UniProtKB/Swiss-Prot annotation, chain B:
Record text on subunit structure and interactions: Component of the large ribosomal subunit.
Gene coding for it: RPL18
Protein name: Large ribosomal subunit protein eL18
Residue location of crosslink Glycyl lysine isopeptide (Lys-Gly) (interchain with G-Cter in SUMO2): 118, 163
Modified residue annotations for Phosphoserine: 129
Region (Disordered): 150-187
Phylogenetic placement of the source organism: Eukaryota, Metazoa, Chordata, Craniata, Vertebrata
Modified sites of kind Phosphothreonine: 157
Cellular compartments annotated: Cytoplasm, Cytosol; Cytoplasm; Rough endoplasmic reticulum
Gene Ontology MF terms: RNA binding; structural constituent of ribosome
Pfam families xrefs: Ribosomal_L18
UniProtKB/Swiss-Prot annotation, chain C:
Family: Belongs to the eukaryotic ribosomal protein eL28 family.
Location within or outside the cell: Cytoplasm
Known partners and oligomeric status: Component of the large ribosomal subunit.
Protein name per UniProt: Large ribosomal subunit protein eL28
Phosphoprotein recorded as keyword: yes
Record function comment: Component of the large ribosomal subunit. The ribosome is a large ribonucleoprotein complex responsible for the synthesis of proteins in the cell.
Gene: RPL28
Keyword Oxidoreductase: no
PANTHER family linked: 60S RIBOSOMAL PROTEIN L28
Organism name: Homo sapiens (Human)
GO BP term, pick one: cytoplasmic translation
From Swiss-Prot, chain D:
Modified-residue entries (N6-succinyllysine), positions: 104
Described function: Component of the large ribosomal subunit. The ribosome is a large ribonucleoprotein complex responsible for the synthesis of proteins in the cell. Binds to G-rich structures in 28S rRNA and in mRNAs. Plays a regulatory role in the translation apparatus; inhibits cell-free translation of mRNAs.
InterPro entries given in the database record: Ribo_uL30_ferredoxin-like_sf, Ribosomal_uL30, Ribosomal_uL30_CS, Ribosomal_uL30_euk, Ribosomal_uL30_euk_arc, Ribosomal_uL30_ferredoxin-like, Ribosomal_uL30_N_euk
Sequence repeats: 8-19, 20-31
Name this protein carries in UniProt: Large ribosomal subunit protein uL30
This protein's record includes keyword Transmembrane: no
Entry keyword set: Acetylation, Cytoplasm, Phosphoprotein, Repeat, Ribonucleoprotein, Ribosomal protein, RNA-binding
Location relative to the cell: Cytoplasm
Biological process, per Gene Ontology: cytoplasmic translation; maturation of LSU-rRNA from tricistronic rRNA transcript (SSU-rRNA, 5.8S rRNA, LSU-rRNA); ribosomal large subunit biogenesis; rRNA processing; translation
GO molecular function: DNA binding; identical protein binding; mRNA binding; RNA binding; structural constituent of ribosome
Curated annotation (Swiss-Prot), chain E:
Protein localization: Cytoplasm, Cytosol; Cytoplasm; Endoplasmic reticulum
GO MF annotation: an example: RNA binding
GO annotations of cellular component type: cytoplasm; cytosol; cytosolic large ribosomal subunit; cytosolic ribosome; endoplasmic reticulum; membrane; synapse
Organism: Homo sapiens (Human)
Family, similarity comment: Belongs to the eukaryotic ribosomal protein eL21 family.
Subunit structure: Component of the large ribosomal subunit.
Residue ranges, compositional bias (Basic and acidic residues): 5-16, 29-38
The entry's keywords: Cytoplasm, Disease variant, Endoplasmic reticulum, Hypotrichosis, Ribonucleoprotein, Ribosomal protein
Disease involvement: Hypotrichosis 12: A form of hypotrichosis, a condition characterized by the presence of less than the normal amount of hair and abnormal hair follicles and shafts, which are thin and atrophic. The extent of scalp and body hair involvement can be very variable, within as well as between families. HYPT12 patients have normal scalp hair density at birth. Hair loss begins during the first 6 months of life and gradually progresses to nearly complete loss of scalp hair. The remaining hairs grow slowly and are thin, sparse, dry, and fragile.
UniProt name for this protein: Large ribosomal subunit protein eL21
Sequence segments annotated as region (Disordered): 5-38
One biological process term in Gene Ontology: cytoplasmic translation
Residues of the full protein shown: 108 to 160 of 160
Length: 48, 187, 125, 225, 53
RNA sequence: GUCGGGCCCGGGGGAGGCCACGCGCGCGUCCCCCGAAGAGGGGGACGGCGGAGCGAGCGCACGGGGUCGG
RNA sequence: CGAAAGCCGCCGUGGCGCAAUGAAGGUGAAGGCCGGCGCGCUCGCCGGCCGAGGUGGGAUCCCGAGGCCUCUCCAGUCCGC
RNA sequence: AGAGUGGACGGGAGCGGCGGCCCGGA
């Protein structure tokens, strides 16, 4: 009975910052797309 | 000069079997390779138990292994002992089992096979489950023998139940003074 | 079995020579002539050895047959080669590598063949 | 397979090179930040004292949180309590200095082993010379020369300490992970004091070496490392 | 102090902060200014020796 | 009052130093102007944002423990 | 060589082990659950199964939410950490 | 030639890069 009571109780629901950016890019999983962007912007040329 | 004690630097442990058994040396080579090049703590435990001595590898009884397999959640797992499977004449029926042992006695092997189970050695264990998955690692009772009945506190102290070293068992052999209060004392 | 037979003859063999800090073997199919599991001429399923020829010209290469593994009379096939040096090295290299017959004794057989050839060729004063 | 495989491994090598470049830029900026912080702290202390003098009062600076201790006596004929305190300080040899963090407990055990150590308050130059010249780390119970920020990061990167500048910053500005950084550091094996000691067996304020020379430990560290 | 730690962790968890629970051994002494209040500090000086007892 | 702090909060203007700052297009975020609601548009600056493969080619060295082609 | 080796099994007598305890007559090592009924009395009647108990630690093994990918997307196919 | 800090195909549906009279595909 106590397990049923707790079960119904738990189912009764409803800027820039350069150094931080550097740590985010140097993170191995999070910074992947960011350094990919940096790499292709370093080596790509489209005008305007 | 440095102030360190050197009396505990050498760790006293087996690094190889003391045996000159070449089959044991071969499967120690195999399991040493497995424990090195694998992340299996199972393989490491099996390796050091292979190093161990015979008193440190007591025989596991068939009935004890029947109970530990009968325990819940262990359906169609491989029972692995590094040691000896002996027979137990106190159990009448044997289920089917998938066992792996260093050594199985004749009647225990016959009972397992005609009950319809499989017996593996360690080389074919390494072929079947090289990681050690689906295994139950047992052991025999390592403190069941007469020397462990004799070890402990001294028999003439209280309150010890240590077996003394007597040359015969009878009413004239160490039952007097020291063992009852009508002769000196009891403790 | 090779590993079992090595665990037997590893320290007790009539071909073993232990003298001053060194260990050698004298079985007839032992390139490099050392007490090793790799260079043992008796315990393996496949073995290659090289010797000087019967007459003092050429090199006999003896390889172990696959089938007759328990019949030592027919178990070895040997061929004498009395070519020049570059062709005999190329032929035994082609033999080992193209047959894929134990291709880790290749360079050892090469060194042994060149030593046997250089000893066979006449001495200069 | 020999084209898609080779372009795949080339892409993998490129990504690893870019990650290396990112971490290098990070450690460069971190060191620049610490240079700013150090000069800010130095000028801040000077300004505080200068402001108190202008006002007519006194500026009592903060009593330091970092000490450098050196075992300066040998191992023959040592009391057991002194022995235990010295090996809790990790001073097992003569001329065998280390960093301690100063509080009441540490100060009282230094007071216990007073006539065996010379200790004091190191400056930023002394922490630089000590970690760069005689910097060894403890990496699975081995004593490894600090030649690699990869080595430092693989042992201490879970605390944000990924370079020798991060290590020096923790030790100098005693952070929340000072215990871990100082325990990573193997105890410094200094040379003999070039020039001598003038008396080993008496306290510094009566003409010897033992005890707390306050900032003359830097003179000793220059002569000794 | 166990019960105080438990109530403190409960209030921190409900209010959404992080608070200190351990105790720390008497830190150093936090740089500060000492006012002289205009007056000059008094000059102390060792006394001559006189034999009483 | 402070060669104080705020990635030196910020914005504007006029014949130098420093920067481990420098592809697009679209999104956001911020700012300016006409602002004919202070709408809708003309722009700039910032971004750790958004489906879609790859620069190479020579050197020199305070660079994972001595070599000389003296 | 060989005074060795091999074999016996209705040659295992016997020893030691497999049971202890008591001076001795002697005695002598398995529980729980489910049902009914007395008076389900701190408990017998029968029946049914299971098989050396429980707690705390405990090497090893098992399941495992969620993660980590592939020129790239849409719907799943496989195994891996 | 052993090469895996995830590899699979296979319809599925579009790109960047090589082959033009816009059609590609070991
Ligand atoms: Mg010594
Ligand atoms: Mg000694
Ligand atoms: Mg002395
Ligand atoms: Mg001198
Ligand atoms: Mg003395
Ligand atoms: Mg300023
Ligand atoms: Mg600004
Ligand atoms: Mg006989
Ligand atoms: Mg018997
Ligand atoms: Mg009998």
């Amino acid at each position: 009975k106590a397990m049923s009571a707790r079960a119904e109780a738990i189912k009764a629901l409803v800027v820039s910052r350069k150094l931080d950016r550097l740590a985010y890019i140097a993170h191995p999983k999070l910074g992947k797309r960011a350094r990919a962007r940096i790499a292709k912007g370093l080596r790509l040329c489209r005008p305007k | 000069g440095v102030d360190i004690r050197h009396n505990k630097d050498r760790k006293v442990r087996r690094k190889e079997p003391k045996s000159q058994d070449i089959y044991l040396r071969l499967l120690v080579k195999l399991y040493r390779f497995l424990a090195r090049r694998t992340n299996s703590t199972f393989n490491q435990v099996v390796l050091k138990r292979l190093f161990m001595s015979r008193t440190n590898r007591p025989p596991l009884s068939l009935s004890r292994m029947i109970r530990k397999m009968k325990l819940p959640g262990r359906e169609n797992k491989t029972a692995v002992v590094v040691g000896t499977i002996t027979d137990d004449v106190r159990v009448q029926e044997v289920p089917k089992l998938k066992v792996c042992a260093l050594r199985v006695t004749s009647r225990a092997r016959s009972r397992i096979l005609r009950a319809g189970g499989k017996i593996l050695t360690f080389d074919q264990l390494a072929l079947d489950s090289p990681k050690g998955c689906g295994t139950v690692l047992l052991s025999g009772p390592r403190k069941g023998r007469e020397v462990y009945r004799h070890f402990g506190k001294a028999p003439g102290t209280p309150h010890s139940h240590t077996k003394p070293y007597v040359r015969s068992k009878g009413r004239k052999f160490e039952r007097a003074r020291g063992r009852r209060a009508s002769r000196g004392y009891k403790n | 079995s090779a590993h079992l037979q090595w665990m037997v003859v590893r320290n007790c063999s009539s071909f073993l020579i232990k003298r001053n800090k060194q260990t050698y073997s004298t079985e007839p199919n032992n390139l490099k002539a050392r007490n090793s599991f790799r260079y043992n001429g008796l315990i393996h399923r496949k073995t290659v050895g090289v010797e000087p020829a019967a007459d003092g010209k050429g090199v006999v290469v003896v390889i172990k047959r696959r089938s007759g593994q328990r019949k030592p009379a027919t178990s070895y096939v040997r061929t004498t080669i009395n070519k020049n040096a570059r062709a005999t090295l190329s032929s035994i290299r082609h033999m080992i590598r193209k047959n894929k017959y134990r291709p880790d004794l290749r360079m050892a057989a090469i060194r042994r063949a060149s030593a046997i050839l250089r000893s066979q060729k006449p001495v200069m004063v | 397979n020999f084209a898609e495989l080779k372009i795949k491994r080339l892409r993998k090598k490129f990504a690893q090179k870019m990650l290396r470049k990112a971490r290098r830029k990070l450690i460069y900026e971190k060191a620049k930040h610490y240079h700013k912080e150090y000069r800010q702290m130095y000028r801040t202390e000077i300004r505080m004292a200068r402001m108190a003098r202008k006002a007519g009062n006194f500026y009592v600076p903060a009593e330091p949180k970092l000490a450098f201790v050196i075992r300066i006596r040998g191992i023959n004929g040592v009391s057991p309590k002194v022995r235990k305190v010295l090996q809790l300080l990790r001073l097992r040899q003569i001329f065998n200095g280390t960093f301690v963090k100063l509080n009441k407990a540490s100060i009282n055990m230094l007071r216990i082993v007073e006539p065996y150590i010379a200790w004091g308050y190191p400056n930023l130059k002394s922490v630089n010379e000590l970690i760069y010249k005689r910097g060894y780390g403890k990496i699975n119970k081995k004593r490894i020369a600090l030649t690699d920020n990869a080595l430092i990061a693989r042992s201490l990167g879970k605390y944000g300490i990924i370079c020798m500048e991060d290590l020096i910053h923790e030790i100098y500005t005693v952070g929340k992970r000072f215990k871990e950084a100082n325990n990573f550091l193997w105890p410094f094996k200094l040379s003999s004091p070039r020039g001598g000691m003038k008396k080993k067996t008496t306290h510094f304020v009566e003409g010897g070496d033992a005890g707390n020379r306050e900032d003359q430990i830097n003179r000793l560290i220059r002569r000794m490392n | 102090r166990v019960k105080e730690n438990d109530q403190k962790k409960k209030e921190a968890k409900e209010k959404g902060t992080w608070v200190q629970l351990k105790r720390q051994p008497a830190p150093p002494r936090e740089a500060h200014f000492v006012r002289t209040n205009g007056k000059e500090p008094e000059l102390l000086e060792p006394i001559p020796y006189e034999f009483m007892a």
